[model samples]
Target chain A: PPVHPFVAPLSYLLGTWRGQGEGEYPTIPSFRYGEEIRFSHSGKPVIAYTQKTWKLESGAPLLAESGYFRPRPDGSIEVVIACSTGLVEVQKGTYNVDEQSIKLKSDLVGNASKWKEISREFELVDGKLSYVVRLSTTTNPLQPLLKAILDKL
Target chain B: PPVHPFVAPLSYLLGTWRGQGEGEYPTIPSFRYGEEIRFSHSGKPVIAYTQKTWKLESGAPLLAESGYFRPRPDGSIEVVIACSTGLVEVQKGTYNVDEQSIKLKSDLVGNASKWKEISREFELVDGKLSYVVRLSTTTNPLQPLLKAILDKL
Candidate 1:
């Protein structure tokens, strides 16, 4: 079956995207990581999302997160994520007119004490899927946590 | 690499489990479903979890949920799940002495106004994986929602 119309707006995220990302936080040393993200559809309105990253040099696994993207008729979207850090997050966003760009903000986070908020933006342009992540902590303000430009596969 | 030791206690959940389940919700008609659940471990300390269910007769697609499981040294366990319903859940549990049985309850749930609580129990007995789910809605009390027995493959 074809991808459900309810989620066709997010079809751009389908398939695999992989690349290297840089992460830095005030409390931790700067580091580089290799990341892979997969998006899939199964004749359902929800898009399946999965991501994993590893240490760039040592090839040590970092973490894996999986979730779903729900697109609504009002042009708004919602994402639910379960992460390895024992955290669950809900993200709300809207797609640009072209449906190729999305900006999401964390509306709710589990283990609220460990994280304050998360912001994510994704843009698909010229065959490159690029994204940036900003993270906030109880003691720290939101700042760039990771950024990467990925090649689609 | 072998499964990470931090999550080794949950190794029994690793593998693909397929089976049939019965569902009963006060607001909906009773139904049966074909369900598949997968648990995988990488070198990371978390166990990846994925589940999908479909209608038994029409083969209509249902929903999919994905997440991770973390086993703590204290013998307690935690799970984070992102569901198609646009809800994220954090479950905390403790394993029985045998580590073959677990009882989990929802400690945090996103979109709290929609759901009251959720309880899950799993038992691996004689190579069969069985589980039961009870859910509480805003207007209803906790009651059985699903029960299933699956075979490991």
Candidate 2:
């Protein structure tokens, strides 16, 4: 099939995005970084995703993650993410298509020595994306990890 | 003006590659990661590039970088990488076509706080790419940061 109807709800995320946001964690110092996220597909049922971040002031490389977003028939969504920080996350969530946003909470986290659980919210508004991430890790309790606003590039 | 003769020498890099490698640094511990790299062109003198890496054991996302490889008329190559780690790097080197390899040394390292100077070498051997990266950073002296062997995927 040339198109996967199952991914219709997530067609909005198929593009390259650039943005900036702040990161704060009790285990690490708070800082701001620029981010680039890209979602592409090869006529598949899921969207391939890659995200990179750098320091806002100097464009220094910070971190990155790669995974996929799979939409369920029941209007729920599944997201699997692997981070460079020795952690893997599997999340399930609901999507608000009309509102152009998706809110996800972690179901299972692997290699939890550094990160135990995480929550993510991505909102598309006015041709841009706003996102927030919160996490509960070994070093800190549940707290905000990062928030950023991004534009399609 | 459809032909980008400068990129002709680098046509071999225009594809997707996958492999696994180990990362080791003086400031950080040794680890293994899966890597994917792609190079494409847009009828221009530069080749588009993107690289992503993950934990090999768990397939967890680790890091990514994207930029361009510009080949000059003098048989020299230039690479500009924007890393998610809050830094950008400009490297210049010469390509040894007979050897099917490129050896690049950093010319200007931006966002020098967390990362300082760096060097990179990429070699194509028997249908595989062998690469090594060395860096001199704030906390560590010049040393190898990563090395990997990748096959065309």
Candidate 3:
């Protein structure tokens, strides 16, 4: 089947996303966060999206890196992201469709990247939504971040 | 470099594997185990082997599959594999270098391939080197085979 209509708009994010978020260095600061955003596009029949993350608190961005995630034919989703400052990080999980959310667990082998499976929960609410990301299997837990709220606009 | 002596032989299989495993009739009475193994050839490029068991004794060979088990410059192992049979299986894990062994668990959908604690002890027996494997899964229990060591061999 063709790309699901609901996910087509994500087409704009067909390339590497480099940006910062409101938070602290190395995911510091528990209360504040901000960062830059870079989204690109791959012109293949099956477009792929890559994202780069960083931390910020007083309006500056800290670089937080991860791998690429592409849609698989099976219901589940696959992700590969990591920080260049260390080893490789990856996660693969099923997307609960009826739940209207995506859950992924990561295997991070990198500097400052502990062995944990982090899950990012995305929910569409009132035409707006946020990705709630949480870390598991680690002690340097920063309160889960509800960073971006986006719509199909 | 050169795929490392400890990892080179497994290179040909350092990728996703999807196939069926077959046992002759009467191997088990009513059930059989369909095995799926995946080896990941990431990082350092070794092979990490994982497996899944099937509930139905395939009238044919159970697909014994594997994934890519790649080695990292840091000496860690990564496993990457997948399957598309009547079952939904995702068994992703890494190798335990210190332990000289690898362990993996799966999230199975539909009738899970029968599985149990199966282990192989590689050692020297009575001055002669030998190895034995203990396997138990949802497949037909090998009680009769266990009773006769010769039969199992």
Candidate 4:
């Protein structure tokens, strides 16, 4: 199947990227990890997204997540992310683009179980991909939770 | 001076947090780093925000940015960040809260020099802070560039 033109806004994200990022929370000490992310076209309007992270020093596994980025006919983007730890998130946002990059934000979020709702914003520019995540878990209120930046490989 | 009640949206962000994250891009290989962030209030509507990061393994300095989070009378937020590398950014957004958590987003960004504009979203929940950042730079188009999650220390 041919890739749909509706997905053009996300075409820049079609590739593999590797980078490092830091993660911290009130419950745990801050630490840094290495990450690899892949965004590939499935010959449709949806793009495949996968992410894996590991301890930078020991190379121990850290976390993993995968999902789909779909361009809807309504000119909105839908993101469905499922984490290995049983966290699933569905986000809907509008996509904006210029000559150089693309940006999207999730105005709505639905999550699973103890996982509270989440909101996410993503950007892709000049071989760099960055995102900010906010979460509201059972115990925690909705707040900024994670940020990551990746470079095209 | 006493803390302004108008600043309630940013009060939760007043404290110290530490965490680790990864950084990668086409210009540089992926690497892990440690980060320290502090937000202090001076009994005013503005909160001081500072952040420092270093190579987690060697403890070598990596990058730092400082700024202020100002609560506006219109119930919006203004953020101004300055980097030693001559990058400065001014971002504006609104604050939203429910019984679960607080969320903010930057709808506008102004930058200096080769630095591009940015969009930022932040959440505070369950003693955790998280944010996603997107940038549009001179060399790069608009894209998601950084995401981070930090725990209160």
lDDT of each model, Cα atoms only? 0.86, 0.77, 0.39, 0.64
B110-135: candidate 4 lDDT, tens digit per residue? 22455556777777756778766666
Estimated TM-score for each candidate: 0.95, 0.53, 0.37, 0.45
User: How well is each residue in A1-153 modelled by candidate 1, as lDDT tens digits?
Assistant: 689888877777899999888888898788889999999988888888999899889888888888888887678888889888888889998877574888899998786586899998889878888889889998999998988888888
lDDT of 1 by residue, B50-120 (tens): 99899888878898888888887678888888888888888888877485888899998786676889988
Off by over 4 Å in 2: A1-153, B1-3
Q: Is the docking of candidate 1 incorrect, acceptable, medium or high quality?
A: high
Off by over 4 Å in 4: A99-112, B1-153
- Which stretches of model 3 miss by more than 4 angstroms? A1-29, A36-40, A43-47, A50-58, A96-100, A107-113, A137-147, A150-153, B1-153
**Model 3 — interface RMS deviation?**
10.4
DockQ of 3: 0.02
Tell me what TM-score chain A of model 3 achieves. 0.59
**For model 3, how does the per-residue alpha-carbon lDDT over B11-116 read when each residue is reduced to its tens digit?**
4444443333333323444333433444442233344444444544433332322233444444444433332221222233344444444433332222224543
Question: Largest DockQ belongs to which candidate?
Answer: 1
lDDT of 2 by residue, A1-153 (tens): 244787778788889999899988877788889999998765556676778787788875666666667776677987766554334566779888789899989876654556787999999989898988999977678778989999998
Which candidate has the top score in lDDT? 1
Candidate scoring better on TM-score of 1 and 3: 1
lDDT of 3 at A17: 31
Model 1 reproduces what portion of true contacts?
A: 0.90
**Interface C-alpha RMSD, model 1:** 0.8
**What is each candidate's DockQ, to 2 decimals?**
0.87, 0.03, 0.02, 0.01
Candidate 1 displacement at residue B16 in angstroms: 0.5
Count backbone clashes in candidate 4: 35
Model 1 residue runs over 4 Å out of place are B97-99
